[PDB]
Amino acid sequence: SARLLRAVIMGAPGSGKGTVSSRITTHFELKHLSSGDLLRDNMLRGTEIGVLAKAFIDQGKLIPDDVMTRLALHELKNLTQYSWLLDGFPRTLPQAEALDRAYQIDTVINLNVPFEVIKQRLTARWIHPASGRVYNIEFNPPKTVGIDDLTGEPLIQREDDKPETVIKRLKAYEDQTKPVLEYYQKKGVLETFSGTETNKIWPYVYAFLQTKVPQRS
Numbered sequence: 001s002a003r004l005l006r007a008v009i010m011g012a013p014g015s016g017k018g019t020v021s022s023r024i025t026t027h028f029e030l031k032h033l034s035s036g037d038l039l040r041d042n043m044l045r046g047t048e049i050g051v052l053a054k055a056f057i058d059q060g061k062l063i064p065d066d067v068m069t070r071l072a073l074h075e076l077k078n079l080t081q082y083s084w085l086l087d088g089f090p091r092t093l094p095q096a097e098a099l100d101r102a103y104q105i106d107t108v109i110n111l112n113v114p115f116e117v118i119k120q121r122l123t124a125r126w127i128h129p130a131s132g133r134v135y136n137i138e139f140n141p142p143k144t145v146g147i148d149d150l151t152g153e154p155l156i157q158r159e160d161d162k163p164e165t166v167i168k169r170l171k172a173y174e175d176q177t178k179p180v181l182e183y184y185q186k187k188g189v190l191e192t193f194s195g196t197e198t199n200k201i202w203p204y205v206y207a208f209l210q211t212k213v214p215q216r217s
């Protein structure tokens, strides 16, 4: 690939962005950058950013743009040499306009999944905090319940996956992030995939990406 790919994946919370991203990075030559993993890492490390982020995350509110754009642009500049997949940034118009001043996004993958469906999924979500690996009791279950397959350490549930917080996160997405979908639609780069199951969507995402980025061994 002479030109490195710059891809974004977007969708309402629980639509499967991180799940699809793990499949993409498994099959395609690109690096996955997750804002949420990055924020949850900053909370473990106790950074300035990590401390102030906790209050927003735990209430289902978007972290201020100034903080998030600086964090994301800084991380991206470490990845000039790779094709990358941005997962969870941008979430607002200022975040999307800033990203554009730095990079030319090739393609924005939009997962359109029912709110009722997604609401139920986040109820059953479990994660391994150190690695960020994601599990569900129905769809991607561990071999033992509540225990990561490898470290054997407790898998946990995000504090933001409580039903009251899920409602708040969905409304924030509707109010602040959907305008970003329209921004990328008018720029000619939005590719939307609708479904209720990741496994019914993945074939189309897979075929679509074959047309944009090399495959991985």
Ligand SMILES: Nc1nc2c(ncn2[C@@H]2O[C@H](COP(=O)(O)OP(=O)(O)OP(=O)(O)OP(=O)(O)OP(=O)(O)OC[C@H]3O[C@@H](n4cnc5c(N)ncnc54)[C@H](O)[C@@H]3O)[C@@H](O)[C@H]2O)c(=O)[nH]1
Binding pocket: 011, 012, 013, 014, 015, 016, 017, 018, 019, 020, 035, 036, 037, 039, 056, 057, 058, 060, 061, 062, 063, 064, 065, 068, 087, 088, 089, 090, 091, 095, 121, 122, 124, 125, 126, 134, 135, 136, 138, 139, 140, 160, 169, 196, 197, 198, 199
């Ligand atoms: N039954 C079934 N299950 C399936 C299926 N497919 C997948 N699943 C399962 O469904 C569950 C959800 O799948 P997932 O892949 O992990 O979902 P996802 O779409 O990535 O959801 P989230 O992580 O919740 O995205 P979201 O936008 O809320 O979070 P995040 O970036 O973490 O942001 C979190 C907070 O951090 C801050 N934040 C994060 N980014 C910010 C930004 N750019 N600006 C400002 N703030 C930002 C904000 O406060 C935000 O609320 C998993 O258990 C998975 O196993 C299926 O087909 N069937």
Ligand SMILES: [Mg+2]
Binding pocket: 017, 018, 019, 036
């Ligand atoms: Mg995620």
